[PDB]
């Protein structure tokens, strides 16, 4: 199932900024062990912006090859050029990804019709399931529910990552699209509520550091055990907040390094988590039992 | 000197979306004849997002080669990866641009310190004058005055395109930087007020279709002739508004096609200006005497 707790996996780098393959393999094994339901490679949290095209397909291939079909691997292949998006999605398909996640074009602010044309083109150009990704707080453009609705009728577009953390928006999307068209959260704090509304997973930053709890949270929320799901979520809340104390993935990378899982590399223009933030994050990690 | 009316030049394409060199040569001639003080090639209005790296240097070289030193040519070389920004800026210098215009990283939301490190790195890596470009409405991040002030002290960073249209911001930036550090407008409607505050130019969409008027506007503003500058701006205002009726450069490309200057190509995910917007824009062009 392309559903449940789907980790938005970081891309580990050594201090020089080179890909750390060993650390990546360790993260994959961690996820397979702790109950994560799908891995999203080279998305926002995986620093897609600072990876070149060749590095991106390499990350995807290494993850695909290690996972060996045990859980779905989703490739972040979005771009603000339709031609570029087709190229990335094609690479990801040949590299054996199960599905691709495509952010709405950032920076260039396409019209609603332009977004339709973009996503519909990629959907017809490359025969791999595709998942939309709306994150206005990053792209500077908002794919409205009616546009999501029109795209939900396009063969090969199978779902949407809704990252606004606006639960009225979530509800409206869920009501407008078909039951086969899966709505996933991209906001850790509110994901539980999104799933209780009928959403079918969470593409999670927190799952990087608490995969078991997040896989438990999603399983509970998706079978309608609101009180159990909410109890896990309420417990995790200090951690959800602290992982955003600076722009993601700066905090989560610091957290994974503190846990001994990845080296201290992050690519400019991202910087290593500020000293003033170490304590708040560290004790949210202690409090939730990840450290 | 890099100052006055600086056109954010479109990049013309045929109906198949291929680069149209003849059209580009016509645009450059138009600007050389009509009093334009500088050309910005392959920036936001130039659809940098949908041009590949090879196409980008091609446009810059063709513009540089035709201008032959008559006015400054500024290349858009911004990226959300510091490594990529270096590659583009390096290519531009080698292609003969007089300066580079570099947008703050879009989408990945660096910290203020991350922005300082990004721009300081590019400034030290490539010996070409560099102009910062703050456009929070597209990048999803805002370079605050304090950061602008810090970067204004870095060798090779000579100015900033302040695109917020916030005149309190402009005033604050102007007060904080050196007199040698040039603040240019990136907002056509308010550019006159920015220049009256001490700003030294306008990197203009409107100058694409009304270069002489915009040239005249900038001259009057920069010499402190407020009544004259305001008079030109008031006359142009219906055009300033209509050129943003859909995301730039969708309107200005429709305008230039209507004026016979470029073919009807625009690259996905941008779309040709919507029918319902034709009348408002055409009427604005008629009223201002552009048509
Ligand atoms: Cl964030
Ligand atoms: Cl716009």
Swiss-Prot record, chains A, B:
GO biological process, one term: diaminopimelate biosynthetic process
Catalytic activity: L-aspartate 4-semialdehyde + pyruvate = (2S,4S)-4-hydroxy-2,3,4,5-tetrahydrodipicolinate + H2O + H(+)
Record's subcellular location: Cytoplasm
CDD domains, per database record: DHDPS
Pathway annotation: Amino-acid biosynthesis; L-lysine biosynthesis via DAP pathway; (S)-tetrahydrodipicolinate from L-aspartate: step 3/4
Residues with site note (Part of a proton relay during catalysis): 44, 107
Tagged with keyword Protein biosynthesis: no
InterPro entries per UniProt: Aldolase_TIM, DapA, DapA-like, Schiff_base-form_aldolases_AS, Schiff_base-form_aldolases_CS
Major enzyme class: lyase
Positions that bind pyruvate: 45, 203
EC number: 4.3.3.7
Gene3D superfamilies hit by this protein: Aldolase class I
Pfam families: DHDPS (PF00701)
Keyword presence, Repeat: no
GO terms for MF: 4-hydroxy-tetrahydrodipicolinate synthase activity
pH and activity: Optimum pH is 8.0. At pH 9.0 or above, only 30% activity is observed.
GO cellular component: cytosol
Active site: 133 (proton donor/acceptor), 161 (schiff-base intermediate with substrate)
Comment on activity versus temperature: Optimum temperature is 37 degrees Celsius. The activity decreases slowly when temperatures are reduced from 37 degrees Celsius while the drop in activity is relatively more rapid when temperatures are raised above 37 degrees Celsius. In this case, the activity reduces to almost 30% at 52 degrees Celsius.
Keywords: Amino-acid biosynthesis, Cytoplasm, Diaminopimelate biosynthesis, Lyase, Lysine biosynthesis, Schiff base
Subunit structure: Homodimer.
Biological role stated in the UniProt entry: Catalyzes the condensation of (S)-aspartate-beta-semialdehyde [(S)-ASA] and pyruvate to 4-hydroxy-tetrahydrodipicolinate (HTPA).
Family: Belongs to the DapA family.
PANTHER family: 4-HYDROXY-2-OXOGLUTARATE ALDOLASE, MITOCHONDRIAL, DIHYDRODIPICOLINATE SYNTHASE
Protein name, per record: 4-hydroxy-tetrahydrodipicolinate synthase
